[PDB]
Amino acid sequence: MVQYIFTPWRNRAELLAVRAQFYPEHTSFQDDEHIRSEKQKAVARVSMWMQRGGCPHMVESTALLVAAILSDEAQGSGAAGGYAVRAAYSAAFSRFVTGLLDSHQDQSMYDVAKAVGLPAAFVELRHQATHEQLPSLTRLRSAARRALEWIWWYYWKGLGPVDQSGWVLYDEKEWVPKPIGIV
Amino acid sequence: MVQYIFTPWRNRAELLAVRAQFYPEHTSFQDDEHIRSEKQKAVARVSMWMQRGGCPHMVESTALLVAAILSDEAQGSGAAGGYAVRAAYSAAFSRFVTGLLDSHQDQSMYDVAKAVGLPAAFVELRHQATHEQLPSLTRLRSAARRALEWIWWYYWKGLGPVDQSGWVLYDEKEWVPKPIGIV
Amino acid sequence: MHHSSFQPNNSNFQRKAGGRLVLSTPDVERFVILGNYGVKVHQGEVTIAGATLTPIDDVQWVHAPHCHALPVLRTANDTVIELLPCPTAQGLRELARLNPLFGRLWNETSDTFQIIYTSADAPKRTSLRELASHPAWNKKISELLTSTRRKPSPILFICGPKSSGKSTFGRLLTNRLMTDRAGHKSRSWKPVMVLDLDPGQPEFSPPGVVSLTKLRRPNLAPPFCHPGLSFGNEGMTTVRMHAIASVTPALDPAHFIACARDLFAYYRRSASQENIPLVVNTPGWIQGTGLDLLAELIAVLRPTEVLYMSEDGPEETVSALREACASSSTIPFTMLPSQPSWTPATLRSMAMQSYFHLSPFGPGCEWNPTPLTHLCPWRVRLAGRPDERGVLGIVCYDHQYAPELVSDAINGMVMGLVRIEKKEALRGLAVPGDTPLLPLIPNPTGSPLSPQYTSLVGLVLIRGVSLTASNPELHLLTPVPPSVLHSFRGDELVLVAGKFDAPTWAYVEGLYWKSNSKDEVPWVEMLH
Amino acid sequence: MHHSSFQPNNSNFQRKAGGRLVLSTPDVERFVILGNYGVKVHQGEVTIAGATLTPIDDVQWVHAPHCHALPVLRTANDTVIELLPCPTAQGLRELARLNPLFGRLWNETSDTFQIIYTSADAPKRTSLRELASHPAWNKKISELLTSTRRKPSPILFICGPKSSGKSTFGRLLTNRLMTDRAGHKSRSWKPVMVLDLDPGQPEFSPPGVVSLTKLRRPNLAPPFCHPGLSFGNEGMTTVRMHAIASVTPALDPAHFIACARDLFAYYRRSASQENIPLVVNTPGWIQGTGLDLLAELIAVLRPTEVLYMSEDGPEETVSALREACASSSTIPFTMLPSQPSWTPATLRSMAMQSYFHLSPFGPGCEWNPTPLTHLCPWRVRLAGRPDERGVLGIVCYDHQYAPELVSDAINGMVMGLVRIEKKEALRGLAVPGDTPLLPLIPNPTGSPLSPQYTSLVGLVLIRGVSLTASNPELHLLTPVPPSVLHSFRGDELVLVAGKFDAPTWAYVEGLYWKSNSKDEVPWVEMLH
């Protein structure tokens, strides 16, 4: 029975829920704040999974992108004073692109990209980011947004439809066997 | 006269000043706020230079690191909710390390590093950041701090000691020749 | 009077008369002249780097700068040629006093033009190259020309990897098309239009600008000798230009294509009447993004013939080109050889500097040897309203800026003077009004002002912002003649500040002058 | 009764008597036995993978798992050997019912141990390897031993790249030192201490833990057959262990070295009295960080002899080692050959699973075949004070957590039960008190609790957090015997949650059992 794939999400409903928070638009002033809050919680949750171990690459990438976007749209004396936002964005793009290219490989960067179907802009943007000069905020912003929609088509949309009394030995007269995790 | 090196800082005093703001400690509640403000201005200024063109690699790196640190120490509803800070840090380390290694090269990564004198930790950290999993916040924080002191010894400390009337043709009877830039 | 050597060829009667040389040749002979001279066939037939001159031909000025490939001259049986000395060239020579890179570019002799022999003349610092051309290139051109005569007015799309030689091919093709005259009363010369979409190393404009040029005479000169054709009999005029404000179309492809569209539009309107062919040369990418741009351009222009100058290029590019080309119903695609120092950086820089020193008025155009620092500047007011101010404001491209920094950032760089035609341009931007601070126009998005309502009126260099608390003003110096600048009110006039590659040469220029002819020059650090 | 084959060797009288085999050999012969058996030389002399047994020798149990290299047995002229069947082995066999990876590890025959011949026995799924040893290895060992006899008690430092074979060398050296007995009334066996600083593939402890072990009998078994020596005649006891909570020392080098220091300290104190040599094997790095660690360790331990098992290793490592080694006044440095399936990942995992099923008490140790899910758990209270609670709290390593998430994060992972000896440990941390929420101990810095005041009392697996609003509690199941757990109040007892590599095997175990013997198992997604 090699048909056993381990995940870090207790069951399925939880994964779907996370999806809902990450993309309110497709799934469905005060209302805007509410949405912002949910996004933050989703990000944190993904962090936990990553530590737990064994998490799909794409999920990690999406978490990173949204995290950056949230930081960019923060009005107050906490807005990452213009030179940090561009860094968060560059980090996310590097991780994301590197993952796809590295995984699907037996060629040159551009050919692998074309094969997978990933627009060339991203590969170029990553290269620029690492080697010579962080890119302009505007470009990064638009790039991130597109990337998110792309990931949607490639991964998310397929995960389903769219609708000393300290220690006491438990009494061996009331215990029942039950799956590790439940109580 | 090939002894002409172009810079993006109008003169020298300006560069030194920037240095002062970037490292208040070596150069010399309200006072803490003041320091924070100065740092921010220094970061922005470096941004401008980078666009202007032709700026020492090290300066850029230092700007990036400080930018990240500032974002991490921001109390309010603008603190980059834990998954962004680690991104800014990773971006800065990647750019910095890549610059040093790429420049001083005719070997393997570790040998070049040892030659330049750069601790091995950084090279490893960068590799981890790009390829497989963003590093833990704690590690990044300590790493950044050390990096800054290192850059100090390597570069900064050497830049000096430590102590239709719209358009009217200007009258050709009062103009004097003077260096491009002054007025 | 019986001259002989190896490299160029023989010759004959070389009569020196009041500065000019009347040389007769009783047989096929090829000469290589290095200098600033003028040709005027007296009896017979001569071919010059792509054109054909016969008795009914006015004088043709030819600049042969030692940098590129010296224009080869070939004479056909029994001819008399009179070589005249170029006058306006004298001005340009002195430009050496303001940049060493302009010193070793011509003849180090006494006169203005010298015939080269094996290696006696043409002194050391060698690589006295020679403009050649594979028999294939010539054969292909021949075919194109003959096809054109029995058809309408074709659009030719030349492209390929950098250094492949697209430039030379373009020069040849253009001259041939224009000058041919082959079978009907010489048909003297059909006007020829050139479209340059290469911000890298442009032709008929300074770096950073795209443009549509109209020629009447055989283009015989490199790009740093007429980068600023007059704006407005009328040998080489300019119809429209657009500011891209970079040295690589890889900072806003959408805008770039939009530009290509508008330019083509005008060509369509004008061409419709009088048969005028078009020669377009594209940038120099062959992979990733660029490849996509090329595909798109081919789709929009619908070129009649596509010429790829590599014959060994990567398989990816060729395949993509063939596909895209095949799609627009059917497009002849061909390949040719290529024949792949001065790196593009320095060349570009020379172009820009030459442009700024262009005098305010096949002969060509005059140059002014006075250093930029001495020239008096244009005082633009910075406190008023949209009708008594001057510059409507400053727009930024691809990057924003905090207010404080802008004063320092703008200072010293190069900007474009874009003229707003229809008010459907600044639609979506807060245009400051009544109002001391630099009236900066916030532009969140970042996209440059659309190309359908804005045109570029020559570049401007800024040499001094002085906001001293009651008379806000900018000191800037331009090459544009007074007439046009005065004929613009103030509302429709905005400055664009992009990359453009900081004009570093300008600062040093003052110093070089002072020392050659025989201290806190901002931005320049003297090592001592 | 006259057996013959190719691979092992000949034999002789094989009398089957009530489960045991008395085999006599009148000449040098080597056997390869695959199974769980027991040796007891009756007359003569035998050598077993590094030890020497003579008439005055108690029974020695030897587990020969088909995974590694089957322990070779060599008999010297005129000997009688009695092979006994291992009893406690029966329990371990059934572990196959809870993980296929434990099924193909022994003899697929009827009995408990079988002699192998050329290939008749030892069935398919081949690579029936054989424990060898280059003559060089043997020669070097011989030298070490003889030097030791005419000196004090040396510390040997073995290291080298992974897969090089450090493991085997260590096994040999240890057995030889202990069992030699060569020249004085057999001196029966001098105790031997082993220091394992390899969190990767440890020996004498589960993954993730560093430790100092004391042996009395020839270690004849792989690492997944005694990973949990008793804690407290007394064949193989454990003195001290430390939790590093990773599978690579590359997450806090400072801590790692500190650990090495404390462990050495104890060895110093004990050794001082009765001459007991020490054998230490280090991790498996040879570049960057690791290389630095090795240099440091060499400095702190001051090894008498350093043995590098590569003979072809990179120049960088050898050079660094020689330098550091040369520095501590003088240290003999040598190189040896190496002889470089089951990837370390699976092996490690098997170690861990075996540890958890270790029963709560020549023979070795017993194993319990009941699945973890069935075992009853330990109910720890989570609402009280530091004297009527149980677990003082939860500390996190190398990473923090927001409060809400922790409940989900901890659940399902493995943690360590660290016992605080001196209150000079939690000095700088807000220890929650009176108080429903999981009493988490905020630890900004991140550095693990110092190694000078805290010791590890065996790992714990968590199978259920139920904070249902009035009786906060944790259901956890451990292998530690009741006695010790009860002999700890509550204040001095903290749980550490690091990496440890999520015990994925545990979940599936329940299912495999149910199906083999013949639905929303969290974390497990069944594809259908």
Establish if B170 belongs to a structural domain: no
Angle at D331 between CA D326 and CA D335, to 5 degrees: 95
Cβ–Cβ contact C250 with A under 8 A: yes
Strands, E assignment, C109-243 = 113-115, 155-159, 192-196, 209-215, 236-243
Q: How many CB atoms lie within 10 A of CB C110?
A: 6
- b/e burial code for range D76-107 (CB count within 10 A of at least 16 → b): eeebebebbbbeebeebbebbbbbebbeebbb
How far, in Å, are B106, B109, D12, D294 from residue B113 at the CA level? 13, 6, 64, 19
- Looking at residue C225, the DSSP 8-state letter turns out to be G
Q: Given an 8 Å threshold on Cβ–Cβ distance, is B170 in contact with C388?
A: no
Establish if A165 belongs to a structural domain: no
- CB burial of residue D501 (10 Å; 0-12, 13-18, 19+): middle
- Looking at residue C344, the DSSP 8-state letter turns out to be H
Q: Given an 8 Å threshold on Cβ–Cβ distance, is B53 in contact with C502?
A: yes
Q: Given an 8 Å threshold on Cβ–Cβ distance, is C463 in contact with B167?
A: no
Angle at C353 between CA C351 and CA C355, to 5 degrees: 70
Helices B57-72 and B85-103 pack at an angle, to 10 degrees, of 170
Establish if B176 belongs to a structural domain: no
Start-to-end Cα distance in chain D: 56
CB D30 within 8 A of CB D9: yes
SS3 content of chain D, % helix, strand, coil (to 5): 25, 25, 50
Tell me the chain B residues in contact with residue D445 when contact means C-beta distances shorter than 8 Å.
138
For residue A39, the chain B residue with the least C-alpha distance is B81
DSSP string, D364-411: ---B--S-TTTS--EEEE-SS-TTSSB---EEESS----HHHHHHHHT
C-alpha–C-alpha distance, residues C214 and C222, integer Å: 17
Token pair listed for C54: 């016969």
Nearest in space to C222 (alpha carbons), one of C75, C314, C342, C125: C342
- CB burial of residue C445 (10 Å; 0-12, 13-18, 19+): exposed
Token pair listed for C84: 């005249």
Q: Given an 8 Å threshold on Cβ–Cβ distance, is A181 in contact with D413?
A: no
C-alpha–C-alpha distance, residues D314 and D253, integer Å: 23
> Which candidate from B110, B137, B139 shows the least CB-CB separation from D288?
B110
Residue D426: phi, psi to the nearest 5? -75, 55
For residue D315, the chain B residue with the least C-alpha distance is B111
Cβ–Cβ contact A70 with B under 8 A: yes
How far, in Å, are C45, C115, C185, C496 from residue C55 at the CA level? 8, 23, 13, 49
Helices B137-154 and B57-72 pack at an angle, to 10 degrees, of 140
Helices (H), D166-215: 166-179
Q: Given an 8 Å threshold on Cβ–Cβ distance, is B124 in contact with D400?
A: no
Tell me the chain B residues in contact with residue C526 when contact means C-beta distances shorter than 8 Å.
3-4
C-alpha–C-alpha distance, residues C92 and D136, integer Å: 84
One-letter amino acid identity for C470?
A: S
Length of chain D: 528
Residue window 139-178, chain B: list those with CB within 8 Å of chain D: 139
* Upper half-sphere CA count for residue C462 (Cβ side, 13 Å): 24
Strands A167-169 and D378-381: antiparallel
Q: In what order do the strands lie in the sheet with C209-215?
A: C236-243, C209-215, C192-196, C278-281, C155-159, C305-308, C333-335
Q: Given an 8 Å threshold on Cβ–Cβ distance, is B76 in contact with A76?
A: yes
Cα R_g (chain D), whole angstroms? 25
**How big is the A-D interface in CB pairs under 8 Å?**
115
- Residue D215 in 3-state DSSP? strand
Q: Residue D86 CA to chain centroid, in angstroms?
A: 21
Those residues whose C-beta lies under 8 Å from the C-beta of residue D173, and which sit 6 or more positions away, are D50, D141, D144, D156, D158, D279
C-alpha–C-alpha distance, residues B41 and D187, integer Å: 78
SS3 content of chain A, % helix, strand, coil (to 5): 60, 5, 35
DSSP string, chain B: ---EEE-SSSSHHHHHHHHHHH-HHHH--HHHHHHHHHHHHHHHHHHHHHHHS---HHHHHHHHHHHHHHHHT--SS-STTTTTHHHHHHHHHHHHHHHHHHHS----HHHHHHHHT--HHHHHHHHHHHHT-PPPHHHHHHHHHHHHHHHHHHTGGGSS----TTEEEPPTTT-----BTB-
Token pair listed for C112: 């203005």
* B-interface mutation test, from A95, A102, A133, most B Cβ less than 10 A away: A95
CB D72 within 8 A of CB D116: no
- Containing D320, the helix (H) or strand (E) segment is helix D315-327
Q: Residue C346 CA to chain centroid, in angstroms?
A: 15
C-alpha–C-alpha distance, residues D222 and D243, integer Å: 22
C-alpha–C-alpha distance, residues C125 and C128, integer Å: 9
C-alpha–C-alpha distance, residues C48 and C30, integer Å: 10
* A-interface mutation test, from D414, D508, D524, most A Cβ less than 10 A away: D524
Chains D and B touch (3+ CB pairs under 8 A): yes
Establish if B174 belongs to a structural domain: no
Beta bridge partners of B106: none
Q: Given an 8 Å threshold on Cβ–Cβ distance, is B170 in contact with C504?
A: no
Token pair listed for B78: 């603008």
C-alpha–C-alpha distance, residues C237 and D233, integer Å: 107
- b/e burial code for range A54-68 (CB count within 10 A of at least 16 → b): ebebebbbbbbbbbb
Q: What are C203-207's contacts with CB under 8 Å, separation 24+?
A: C203/C167, C203/C170, C203/C281, C204/C229, C204/C236, C204/C238, C205/C238, C205/C241, C206/C351, C206/C352, C206/C355, C206/C459, C207/C247, C207/C348, C207/C351, C207/C352, C207/C500, C207/C501
C-alpha–C-alpha distance, residues D124 and D104, integer Å: 11
Which chains are within 8 Å of B by 3+ CB pairs?
A, C, D
Start-to-end Cα distance in chain B: 27
Nearest in space to A94 (alpha carbons), one of D202, C290, B127, D241: B127
Start-to-end Cα distance in chain A: 27
- Looking at residue C352, the DSSP 8-state letter turns out to be H
- CB burial of residue A84 (10 Å; 0-12, 13-18, 19+): buried
C-alpha–C-alpha distance, residues C310 and C340, integer Å: 9
Nearest in space to D40 (alpha carbons), one of D106, D86, D8: D86
Cβ–Cβ contact A118 with C under 8 A: no
Cα R_g (chain C), whole angstroms? 25
C-alpha–C-alpha distance, residues C455 and C156, integer Å: 25
Establish if A4 belongs to a structural domain: no
Beta bridge partners of A168: D379
Cβ–Cβ contact A29 with D under 8 A: no
Q: How many CB atoms lie within 10 A of CB D32?
A: 23
* CA-CA-CA-CA dihedral for D510, D512, D514, D518, to nearest 10: -170
Cβ–Cβ contact A83 with B under 8 A: yes
Structural domain tally of chain A?
1
CB C84 within 8 A of CB C58: no
Token pair listed for A72: 């960019």
Nearest in space to C153 (alpha carbons), one of C128, C98, C190: C190
Token pair listed for C363: 């002969």
How far, in Å, are B102, C160, C222, C264, C333 from residue C284 at the CA level? 26, 6, 19, 20, 18
Report the 3 state secondary structure along C373-438. CCCCCEEEECCCCCCCCECCCEEECCCCCCHHHHHHHHCCCEEEEEEECCCCCCCCCCCCCCCCCC
Q: Given an 8 Å threshold on Cβ–Cβ distance, is A4 in contact with D508?
A: yes
How far, in Å, are B38, C19, C248, C415 from residue C497 at the CA level? 27, 48, 16, 5
Tell me the chain B residues in contact with residue C402 when contact means C-beta distances shorter than 8 Å.
44
For residue B141, the chain D residue with the least C-alpha distance is D445
- Containing D506, the helix (H) or strand (E) segment is helix D504-517
Establish if B57 belongs to a structural domain: yes
Cβ–Cβ contact C323 with A under 8 A: no
Q: Residue B93 CA to chain centroid, in angstroms?
A: 12
C-alpha–C-alpha distance, residues D424 and D418, integer Å: 14
C-alpha–C-alpha distance, residues D13 and D83, integer Å: 13
* CA-CA-CA-CA dihedral for C133, C135, C137, C138, to nearest 10: 100
Q: Given an 8 Å threshold on Cβ–Cβ distance, is A180 in contact with D378?
A: no
* B-interface mutation test, from A57, A66, A71, most B Cβ less than 10 A away: A71
DSSP string, D244-308: --SSSSTT-HHHHHHHHHHHHHHHHHHHTTS---EEEE--S--STHHHHHHHHHHHHH--SEEEE
- Looking at residue C291, the DSSP 8-state letter turns out to be H
| Expt. technique | cryo-EM
How far, in Å, are C12, C14, C83, C193 from residue C2 at the CA level? 5, 8, 18, 43
- CB burial of residue D22 (10 Å; 0-12, 13-18, 19+): middle
Those residues whose C-beta lies under 8 Å from the C-beta of residue D170, and which sit 6 or more positions away, are D158, D194, D203, D279, D281
How far, in Å, are A16, A63, C455, D291 from residue A158 at the CA level? 11, 18, 49, 46
Token pair listed for A165: 């009394």
Residue A68: phi, psi to the nearest 5? -60, -50
- Residue C248 in 3-state DSSP? coil
* D-interface mutation test, from B72, B126, B138, B146, most D Cβ less than 10 A away: B138
CB D279 within 8 A of CB D173: yes
Token pair listed for C23: 């040389």
CB C507 within 8 A of CB C524: yes
Nearest in space to C32 (alpha carbons), one of C106, C104, C128: C128
C-alpha–C-alpha distance, residues A83 and B47, integer Å: 7
* CA-CA-CA-CA dihedral for C506, C508, C511, C517, to nearest 10: -70
* B-interface mutation test, from D248, D251, D289, D316, most B Cβ less than 10 A away: D289
Q: How many CB atoms lie within 10 A of CB D424?
A: 10
Tell me the chain C residues in contact with residue A72 when contact means C-beta distances shorter than 8 Å.
none
| Domain extent at residue B87 | 12-158
Tell me the chain C residues in contact with residue A138 when contact means C-beta distances shorter than 8 Å.
398-399, 445-446
For residue A55, the chain D residue with the least C-alpha distance is D523
Q: Given an 8 Å threshold on Cβ–Cβ distance, is B80 in contact with A88?
A: yes
Residue C159: phi, psi to the nearest 5? -155, 175
CB D283 within 8 A of CB D199: yes
Nearest in space to D71 (alpha carbons), one of D119, D38, D103, D110: D38
C-alpha–C-alpha distance, residues D497 and A141, integer Å: 38
C-alpha–C-alpha distance, residues C189 and C218, integer Å: 9
C-alpha–C-alpha distance, residues C211 and C202, integer Å: 9
Residue C370: phi, psi to the nearest 5? -75, 140
Establish if B23 belongs to a structural domain: yes
> Which candidate from D292, D399, D402 shows the least CB-CB separation from B136?
D399
C-alpha–C-alpha distance, residues C424 and C492, integer Å: 12
* CA-CA-CA-CA dihedral for D476, D480, D485, D487, to nearest 10: 180
Tell me the chain D residues in contact with residue B85 when contact means C-beta distances shorter than 8 Å.
none
Task: Answer yes or no: is D272 a known binding residue.
Answer: no
C-alpha–C-alpha distance, residues C145 and C495, integer Å: 44
How far, in Å, are B166, C396, C449, C455 from residue C494 at the CA level? 13, 11, 10, 10
Chains A and C touch (3+ CB pairs under 8 A): yes
C-alpha–C-alpha distance, residues C160 and C333, integer Å: 12
Q: Given an 8 Å threshold on Cβ–Cβ distance, is A48 in contact with D463?
A: no
For residue D445, the chain B residue with the least C-alpha distance is B138
For residue A87, the chain B residue with the least C-alpha distance is B88
Cβ–Cβ contact B44 with C under 8 A: yes
Establish if B167 belongs to a structural domain: no
Residue C84: phi, psi to the nearest 5? -100, 150
Alpha-carbon distance C246 to nearest alpha carbon in chain A (angstroms): 14
C-alpha–C-alpha distance, residues D416 and B21, integer Å: 46
CB C206 within 8 A of CB C227: yes
Give the residue numbers of the binding site of C for Mg(2+): 167
- CB burial of residue C49 (10 Å; 0-12, 13-18, 19+): buried
* A-interface mutation test, from B36, B52, B66, B83, most A Cβ less than 10 A away: B83
C-alpha–C-alpha distance, residues A121 and A107, integer Å: 18
Nearest in space to A42 (alpha carbons), one of D470, D363, B18, B82: B82
- Containing D38, the helix (H) or strand (E) segment is strand D29-39
Those residues whose C-beta lies under 8 Å from the C-beta of residue D526, and which sit 6 or more positions away, are A3, A4, D519
- CB burial of residue D142 (10 Å; 0-12, 13-18, 19+): exposed
C-alpha–C-alpha distance, residues B76 and A69, integer Å: 18
CB C385 within 8 A of CB C505: no
For residue A55, the chain B residue with the least C-alpha distance is B133
Q: Given an 8 Å threshold on Cβ–Cβ distance, is C398 in contact with A124?
A: no
Nearest in space to C83 (alpha carbons), one of C45, C44, C112: C112
Cβ–Cβ contact D380 with A under 8 A: yes
Cβ–Cβ contact C398 with A under 8 A: yes
> Which candidate from C378, C466, C512 shows the least CB-CB separation from B183?
C466
CB C481 within 8 A of CB C227: no
- Residue C12 in 3-state DSSP? coil
CB D89 within 8 A of CB D36: yes
Cβ–Cβ contact B101 with D under 8 A: no
Token pair listed for C460: 């401007």
CB C195 within 8 A of CB C280: yes
Q: What is the resolution of this structure in A?
A: 3.2
Which chains are within 8 Å of D by 3+ CB pairs?
A, B
CB C210 within 8 A of CB C244: yes
